[PDB]
Amino acid sequence: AKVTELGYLGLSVSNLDAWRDYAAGIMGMQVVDDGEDDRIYLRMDRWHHRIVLHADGSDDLAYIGWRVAGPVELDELAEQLKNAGIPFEVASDADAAERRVLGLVKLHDPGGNPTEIFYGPQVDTSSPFHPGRPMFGKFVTEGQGLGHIIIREDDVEEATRFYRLLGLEGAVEYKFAVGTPVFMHCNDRHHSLAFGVGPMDKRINHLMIEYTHLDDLGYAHDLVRQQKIDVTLQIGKHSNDEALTFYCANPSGWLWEPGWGSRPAPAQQEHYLRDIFGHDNEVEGYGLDIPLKG
Amino acid sequence: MAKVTELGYLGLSVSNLDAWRDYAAGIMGMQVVDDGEDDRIYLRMDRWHHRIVLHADGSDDLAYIGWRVAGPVELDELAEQLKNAGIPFEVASDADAAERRVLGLVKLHDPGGNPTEIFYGPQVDTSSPFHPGRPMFGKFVTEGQGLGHIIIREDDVEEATRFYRLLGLEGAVEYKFALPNGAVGTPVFMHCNDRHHSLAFGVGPMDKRINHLMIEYTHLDDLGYAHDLVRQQKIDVTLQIGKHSNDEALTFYCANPSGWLWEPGWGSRPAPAQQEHYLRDIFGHDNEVEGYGLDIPLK
Amino acid sequence: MAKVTELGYLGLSVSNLDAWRDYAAGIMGMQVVDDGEDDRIYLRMDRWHHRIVLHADGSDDLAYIGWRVAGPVELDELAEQLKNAGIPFEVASDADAAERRVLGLVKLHDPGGNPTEIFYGPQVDTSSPFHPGRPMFGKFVTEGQGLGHIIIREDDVEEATRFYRLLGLEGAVEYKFALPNGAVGTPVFMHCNDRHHSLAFGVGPMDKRINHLMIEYTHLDDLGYAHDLVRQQKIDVTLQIGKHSNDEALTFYCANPSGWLWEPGWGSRPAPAQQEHYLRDIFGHDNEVEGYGLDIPLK
Amino acid sequence: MAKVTELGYLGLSVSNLDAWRDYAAGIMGMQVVDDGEDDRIYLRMDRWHHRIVLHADGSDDLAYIGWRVAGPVELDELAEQLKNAGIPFEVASDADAAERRVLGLVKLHDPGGNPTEIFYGPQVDTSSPFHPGRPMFGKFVTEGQGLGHIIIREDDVEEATRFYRLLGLEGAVEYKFALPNGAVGTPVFMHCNDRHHSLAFGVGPMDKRINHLMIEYTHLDDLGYAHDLVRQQKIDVTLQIGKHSNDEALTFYCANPSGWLWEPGWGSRPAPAQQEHYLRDIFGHDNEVEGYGLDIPLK
Amino acid sequence: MAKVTELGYLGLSVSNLDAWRDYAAGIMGMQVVDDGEDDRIYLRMDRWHHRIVLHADGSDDLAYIGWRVAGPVELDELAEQLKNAGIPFEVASDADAAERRVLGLVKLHDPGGNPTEIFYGPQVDTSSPFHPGRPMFGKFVTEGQGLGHIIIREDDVEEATRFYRLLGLEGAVEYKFALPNGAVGTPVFMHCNDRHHSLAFGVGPMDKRINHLMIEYTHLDDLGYAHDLVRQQKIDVTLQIGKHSNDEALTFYCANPSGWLWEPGWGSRPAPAQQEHYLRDIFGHDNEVEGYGLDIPLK
Amino acid sequence: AKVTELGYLGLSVSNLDAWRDYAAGIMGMQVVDDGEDDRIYLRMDRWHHRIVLHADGSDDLAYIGWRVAGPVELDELAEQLKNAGIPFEVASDADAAERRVLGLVKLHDPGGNPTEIFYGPQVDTSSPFHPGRPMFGKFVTEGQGLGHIIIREDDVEEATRFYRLLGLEGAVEYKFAVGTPVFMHCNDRHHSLAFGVGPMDKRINHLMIEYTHLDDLGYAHDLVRQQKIDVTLQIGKHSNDEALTFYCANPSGWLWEPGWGSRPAPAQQEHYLRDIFGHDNEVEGYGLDIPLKG
Ligand SMILES: Cc1cccc(O)c1O
Ligand SMILES: Cc1cccc(O)c1O
Ligand SMILES: [Fe+3]
Ligand SMILES: [Fe+3]
Ligand SMILES: [Fe+3]
Ligand SMILES: [Fe+3]
Ligand SMILES: [Fe+3]
Ligand SMILES: [Fe+3]
């Protein structure tokens, strides 16, 4: 049994209103507020949510939620964790209910990042996805999770082994001292996870979100520029995912990467030396201060 | 040769703008578009700037019907056909065209006295994507099919049929109903594209220019959503959910803020290549709230 | 320009209604439709109210042939073509049209004296789905292809060909057979849609207006079912199962209650885009019970 | 309006029937058909009774070219076009048509004096399937494309082009070659269906009515089989395997028993929608055995 | 009836051949073709010998526009239409046609005085496959769509529209822009195939015959490659990457060696079946380096 | 875990310039020169290279590179090798980097042919394949490797067993003393490997390369004839792969077989007695001096 997608993220944020303006107003996510005094939700599709924003006063990643197919698969993964000697907690019904899931296992990755494994997310079919700004299309999420993340790992090799145990597959995909970032996938999304990208001052570097329609990316890009939000890498294409993407600052001081047209991960491992086109460095200091093309 | 290609727009006279916004956007899912005109707003269903203009003039009826042609050459040909038939028409100026948000325009009347417009080059607001007035599972069916269809008043069914044939619509009688006096009601339905029909008439006496407008969702769940809302808001349903034998669409008929009917629907089939007629509907469409001009027994 | 689009219906004169029900429904799978008319019943093959009218008048022959056109404009054009050719015709009233269960109708005769009708707008009973008179694996092939095809009497093959070309059918000679006196039999086959042919003639002397009617099943197993029943009920088979080289359909020819032939079939190919002719059949169609006008050696 | 639809057949005058059987059946894979006529046999390539008639008359050239039309109405229209152009023609009797194994026929000559026939209704022998004169991996390409294509003698290229345009073929110059005197050779190629061309001319002086016939296999391996046999039997190859830039077909050119050329091929592309021209071939087609009228340098 | 089928070629007057090679091949990916002519070279984009002729004559503007028709019959018909409209034209000789590398040619001028050519039978160099002047991920989009599109000078928009309609192009106004004096700019766009447009004009005052040429890549990555190079080589970009609402193509506008604009692009949609108009672009196309005649605010 | 393709070849050559003229100028490969004093590269697709030419002064095969999906699969194959008792070396990072791969195992086949197993080839997406002469199309390589090779085996049965362990599948496909050549596949390419073809005076007999477009083969064939390069077998079709191919000499004195339209290997083993058509013997002495048709 393997994890099947990157189901949700929990984020600790200092400014909820700024996040609504950003994630809804620009990116097109739907804000969902169920009356909880300490959190709101960002929705991207049928699921009740893909992102939880905790009114916490911090500005980093809080937890990463990996999906499995069902209770049997969860138990099998948990049995594997026990076998390998990795500490985990079987969460209570009320903890599962908090995350809007039926079953939950809580643990950590070798870099100490809070990691949860779940099945049975809450799906709000009866209330159709309604975007925070006008959208030409939708988000790419069905069977692919909410997007992908680059996270902090002090031991790249331990992290690779850990995620392989969860069922992710991948290896080093770039050679840039040589920087050799590792990219991993668990479904049709080129990668759900990456790490080993040099020094990070937060647990998360970026989250990439994917539009179905190129025009929604153009819409988002125009707005980011109109609102003078920092762009760290201009519109371009990485050699690995071949997606058209840009990297811009979010209210928490790390990066979101709106994009379009990502390909599936190759059946067999490849590596690259540089990006295809674009991705010119602009505003430095967000952890992506490397020449991606040369 | 040149023919009308779709029912492009409707201009409506309304007495209450606030109720219409609540109704057309809040229930039906249309997008309200306000360009700051002191006397009008618009309802948008797709890429086009609008499909419906609401004129806040205090009346509650149809103001004008806009039929689309492919281009200026086609308009010119149609106008020439009108001139040959001795049908009076107005060639709109650039300011008249700009008003309707079109490139070129001809204004006239059908035989029933319904203001009729023929135009090309709708304004399309590609840059600001359609954003529904309530959450939607899908979209509206409009592309190459126009906004929907309408039943309108015709005192002379045959003259109306001849007129619309000249415009390029095709059709004939699709139903035969038994009337009280031993006469037969024989409503005419006409099409100019893949939409089963864009136009119907000959349903008997009407106190308004328009009986109903039918609008179509791509997704069944949007019909369910709209139906649940109509029922919740205690809005009159004249005909319950069902299917006519002609379009085979799943639809209901309900009151709008102007006292006539809208018919939200789903799954409309294309017009058959060859003329057919029917004596009844397939299922549902049971009569409920009476007095909207569709009190006839459909089964 | 306007052309007949399919063989829509046949009116038949019969002497025994009870035997025809047993035969057409009980064996063939057609649906019996009785509207309470004292002198007639109907056989239904699909969505249409009927494809065949049985007139219980005591005769046993064809009464009329109904050819479909797309609509009233097309009918009008065809009528104009008849008037130009100096062919006499009757424009049916609304009551005449209602009788045939159509919207509009023209009545005339072909050159062989066969009563011929041209109509638009068949009554379709969508609300009560086709329900076969015996269990069926599939359905009949009719959609855009009419009820099947017929071989009819023509004393003048060339005049008949010219007449039917005017109607919009296309075709020519498809077989050449050697006759006893050194002459050649050259039957003409004609089509107006995807059905290989709707009409054939020039098969020589006939004592009735009609030689056969061919009906087509969607599913081979329905042909097998019907064939097994015909054999069980000891009904005369004039030509055993086989295939003509023209339509390439798997068919047999058997007696009906009126003493002429029905040809149940399956897998009929479309008419070739360009004219072809043949000297024999592919396989089977061996002569069995003689005296039904098809005693010719097909191989 | 009406146009020729394919190159249907060729009649050939031959001096040696035995060698032609050995060649066309034994190497090429055609089916020999002998109906017991004392003076002729046939070569069959598909469902049709034949594509080629061999007249054992002692000459070694083309006897006649048969172009197909869809039917008798189309023939009539073409004949009317010939009469309007003041082109003399013969309307064949039923016995003349029977000879060619067709339903209707018109006989005339092209401007180069090549006997030209226009016909409808080929005899198709569906009942006895095509059986090749040597084992075949596949079949011939003929359906809706005729037997292949031919290069024929024309003393007046422009008159020939005008004549064939009247017949309904389309085309123009497809190559420009540099000639010794500073002139340019500009061969014309023409098509009437999906076959890149059915006809070409203007290749300069010819001592026979026909330069070559091209025949196409469905399967590459049949070309390989035929090529291996030609080489084994020491039959002259004038142009080795290669590809012309126009049809992009993989072909070679070899001698037949009458001293002219057959061009077995595979993978012919359809004629481009719009006229193109070329200055050379793609690959191969290197000159080998000279003196068959194609000694020109193709690259 | 007969119509132009694509924008086939452009002849350009240039002052610097070396810079144009560097630009069109080294950046854009076109193939340089040098046939040893002392005064000209060619740029190739596909199978055709060339799409663009560069005349090293010291000027820096458009020299001629070549529109394609399907064949000699179509050319003849178009010429007849020009003669009927009282439009003067030159029927090119075989040497004139050979110069342009075509089979037949007509030379004239549009109402703006732009030299306009109508031709059939381009020379296609199938034997030497397209080999780009820089490494390419894909190819150019040209097949049945011509080389791209152009904006050209027209002092009389209406006369220009009428002229091009006669040629067989279709279109009308696609944008309305607000001008400083309260007037409206209304550029006309026209198409003759699946390319959204081949031609546009009415963008106001121009100091050259041509404002821009748009060329389309099959693969997005080639646009990225070309864009990266333009930026690296410090070549002026007048409009940044973006999308017009009409063609919905992803494009940028940059300077060429002659001081006018090329617009490399990707993902152009087909022209809508029916006329549409817009008030702004979708995204990007922000004004950068000014003074190339496109300083207008597109959003 | 199985090998997935014949990823690359290393060739020892005496004349680099003659190889550029031949492989680029005629065949359409792309020459890649990264400044190494002792080697250049032949490229056929997205990959940095498919062939390495070592300026060595020899004229034979140097090494055969077999691809696996990733590091896990490499380790599993290596564990299988250890189990069967076959000697192998886990190559250093710098050895892996030399071959432009992420991970490498070096060994030999039973015939002593140098054999490498790898994952993660260098892919140069940003610099599109640009052919050494004009091409109508491209090479068939995606998921099929660079082509196929016939190599020297003194023990056919041991070689068959060895390659089965690597994951190749096949058996004798021809019966021509009876010559019974063995053909083996690991993907959609009819075969990647063959052996048991009689006496060989080099380690490699031929390499077959496949064009997508028939016209590129005609182009190559014309040039081979124009340049008077020895053709040993004329244009023809083998019964097994049913590809249209010819066999011609290369600057190293063995053979390249340009071809088109190869079919996939049958699901089930077949054998043949002769070729379909063509392949007539021409210039003898290249190790293919047999009557293939009779
Ligand atoms: C930031 C970054 C750099 C290189 C490759 C990637 O996939 C990526 O996300
Ligand atoms: C040389 C050779 C001979 C026979 C079969 C083959 O596949 C082959 O490559
Ligand atoms: Fe990323
Ligand atoms: Fe309705
Ligand atoms: Fe029959
Ligand atoms: Fe030829
Ligand atoms: Fe443009
Ligand atoms: Fe081989």
Side-chain angles (χ1 to χ4, degrees), chain A residues 13-74:
Chain A
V13 308
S14 58
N15 195 326
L16 280 191
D17 292 347
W19 270 101
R20 300 197 220 216
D21 292 337
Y22 180 78
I26 294 174
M27 301 306 170
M29 295 189 180
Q30 175 175 10
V31 176
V32 181
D33 179 4
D34 294 334
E36 289 154 305
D37 46 29
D38 62 347
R39 73 198 66 190
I40 57 173
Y41 303 92
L42 295 178
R43 185 189 194 202
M44 295 168 68
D45 64 2
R46 278 190 324 146
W47 287 33
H48 170 84
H49 69 276
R50 307 312 294 232
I51 306 174
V52 191
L53 306 168
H54 292 263
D56 201 8
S58 165
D59 279 306
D60 209 353
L61 178 73
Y63 51 87
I64 304 164
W66 299 101
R67 194 186 186 184
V68 296
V72 175
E73 299 85 350
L74 184 52

Side-chain angles (χ1 to χ4, degrees), chain C residues 9-39:
Chain C
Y9 60 72
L10 292 171
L12 266 36
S13 293
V14 304
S15 59
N16 189 344
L17 236 26
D18 276 13
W20 268 102
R21 297 180 66 141
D22 284 14
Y23 177 89
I27 301 172
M28 298 309 168
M30 297 190 178
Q31 185 178 2
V32 173
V33 177
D34 190 338
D35 289 331
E37 282 154 314
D38 43 343
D39 66 347

Side-chain angles (χ1 to χ4, degrees), chain F residues 193-215:
Chain F
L193 178 69
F195 47 82
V197 295
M200 276 168 277
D201 48 37
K202 286 181 168 89
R203 293 168 188 287
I204 186 163
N205 174 79
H206 80 265
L207 161 68
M208 110 71 55
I209 65 177
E210 187 178 357
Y211 295 118
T212 58
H213 285 53
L214 180 50
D215 291 352

Side-chain angles (χ1 to χ4, degrees), chain D residues 165 173 274-277 280, chain E residues 5 47 68 70 103 121-122 124:
Chain D
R165 287 198 183 123
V173 172
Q274 310 185 230
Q275 193 59 41
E276 285 176 11
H277 83 272
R280 65 161 269 178
Chain E
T5 59
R47 264 198 325 153
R68 190 195 192 182
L103 292 179
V124 184

Side-chain angles (χ1 to χ4, degrees), chain C residues 7 28 91 96 106 151 212 247:
Chain C
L7 184 62
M28 298 309 168
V91 179
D96 289 332
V106 131
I151 286 190
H212 80 269
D247 54 17

Side-chain angles (χ1 to χ4, degrees), chain C residues 1-138 140-233 235-298:
Chain C
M1 188 86 83
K3 300 165 169 67
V4 169
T5 59
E6 57 175 289
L7 184 62
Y9 60 72
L10 292 171
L12 266 36
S13 293
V14 304
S15 59
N16 189 344
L17 236 26
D18 276 13
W20 268 102
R21 297 180 66 141
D22 284 14
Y23 177 89
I27 301 172
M28 298 309 168
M30 297 190 178
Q31 185 178 2
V32 173
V33 177
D34 190 338
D35 289 331
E37 282 154 314
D38 43 343
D39 66 347
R40 72 194 75 186
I41 59 165
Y42 309 81
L43 300 168
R44 176 179 198 214
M45 298 172 67
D46 61 3
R47 264 198 325 153
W48 290 31
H49 173 263
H50 70 276
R51 304 320 292 241
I52 307 170
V53 192
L54 302 174
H55 295 266
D57 67 17
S59 172
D60 279 303
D61 211 333
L62 177 73
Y64 49 84
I65 300 155
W67 301 97
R68 190 195 192 182
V69 295
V73 182
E74 294 81 2
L75 185 59
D76 258 56
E77 295 177 306
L78 262 188
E80 212 70 75
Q81 288 182 273
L82 295 168
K83 187 175 165 173
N84 289 346
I87 294 163
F89 63 90
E90 176 172 314
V91 179
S93 67
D94 295 336
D96 289 332
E99 198 194 0
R100 298 290 190 259
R101 317 302 185 89
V102 298
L103 292 179
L105 175 75
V106 131
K107 297 174 168 167
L108 61 155
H109 293 78
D110 81 1
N114 307 118
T116 299
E117 314 194 338
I118 310 150
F119 76 95
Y120 74 89
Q123 176 190 330
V124 184
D125 291 346
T126 309
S127 63
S128 199
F130 174 75
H131 193 55
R134 54 80 162 181
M136 283 188 71
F137 292 93
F140 288 97
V141 178
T142 59
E143 187 69 59
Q145 287 190 50
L147 79 152
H149 73 245
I150 55 178
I151 286 190
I152 59 172
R153 192 169 58 199
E154 303 296 338
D155 70 317
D156 191 326
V157 179
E158 210 167 20
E159 268 176 15
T161 311
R162 297 185 196 104
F163 171 78
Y164 288 108
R165 287 198 183 123
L166 185 166
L167 257 59
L169 289 115
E170 296 176 348
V173 172
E174 286 191 344
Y175 276 85
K176 291 166 73 183
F177 304 112
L179 296 175
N181 72 318
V184 186
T186 52
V188 173
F189 295 74
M190 308 189 78
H191 42 85
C192 58
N193 57 49
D194 277 348
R195 190 180 297 285
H196 174 89
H197 57 106
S198 304
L199 182 60
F201 45 83
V203 295
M206 286 170 57
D207 69 351
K208 289 190 171 71
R209 280 178 177 153
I210 185 154
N211 173 72
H212 80 269
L213 165 64
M214 182 282 186
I215 63 183
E216 188 183 356
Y217 295 114
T218 59
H219 288 55
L220 175 47
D221 293 344
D222 278 324
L223 179 65
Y225 189 111
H227 178 250
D228 274 1
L229 255 172
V230 168
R231 291 290 183 192
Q232 191 187 45
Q233 293 200 25
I235 300 175
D236 292 347
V237 166
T238 76
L239 298 165
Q240 309 182 332
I241 301 164
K243 280 201 184 166
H244 300 295
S245 298
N246 62 347
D247 54 17
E248 300 192 14
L250 195 66
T251 79
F252 69 101
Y253 290 75
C254 68
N256 63 44
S258 289
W260 53 281
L261 300 175
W262 276 21
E263 186 203 351
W266 172 84
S268 198
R269 78 172 180 152
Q274 310 185 230
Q275 193 59 41
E276 285 176 11
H277 83 272
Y278 318 96
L279 302 183
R280 65 161 269 178
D281 280 4
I282 311 173
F283 64 85
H285 282 336
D286 309 283
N287 299 82
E288 198 172 328
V289 185
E290 293 192 57
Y292 290 84
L294 289 171
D295 288 331
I296 176 93
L298 282 161

